[PDB]
Ligand binder design. Structure first.
Ligand SMILES: C[C@@H]1CCCC[C@H]1OC(=O)N1CCC[C@H](C(N)=O)C1
Ligand SMILES: [Zn+2]
Length: 139
């Protein structure tokens, strides 16, 4: 679990969104595993606007942060799960690292701010849904 709070927006994994996220929907994209909902309180986070390919992410299943090198956002095949059929997920960045069920929502950050959130795992890999291209989160 986990979310990004920026301005009057809450960014979560689409497959973990709650009834309240859907009742306050701003934007969602099943192909990216993202959903953004509106909040009444001002958020705690700032978004990176950069091309970093190294950063640090939080892994809840180990209660620790790990440094990673990750690929540029791309279209990657993701196997069928109880949340989605087998499909290509877009704007996804892979890295070698630990990720198990429950780790989705962990934040990946670089020196410029939040880069994205954990969205895929298994096989000694961790995949992150990029948010750096969503410029409207800042306004
Ligand atoms: C994080 C899990 C670790 C063990 C192996 C499976 C890993 O699950 C996943 O990669 N997904 C399940 C939830 C939905 C994700 C998505 N963005 O489509 C894909
Ligand atoms: Zn950066």
């Amino acid at each position: 679990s986990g979310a990004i709070y920026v301005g009057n927006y809450r960014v979560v994994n689409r497959h973990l969104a709650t009834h309240n996220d859907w009742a306050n929907l701003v934007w969602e994209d099943s192909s990216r595993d993202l959903l953004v909902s509106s909040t009444t309180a001002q958020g705690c986070d700032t978004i990176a606007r950069c091309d970093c390919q190294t950063g640090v992410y939080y892994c809840s299943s180990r209660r620790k942060h790990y440094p990673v090198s990750f690929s540029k956002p791309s279209l990657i095949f993701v196997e069928a799960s109880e949340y989605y059929p087998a499909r290509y997920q877009s704007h996804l960045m892979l890295a070698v690292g630990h990720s198990e069920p429950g780790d989705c929502g962990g934040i990946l950050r670089c020196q410029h701010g939040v880069v994205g959130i954990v969205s895929t795992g298994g096989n000694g890999l961790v995949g992150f849904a990029d948010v750096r291209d969503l410029l409207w989160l800042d306004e």
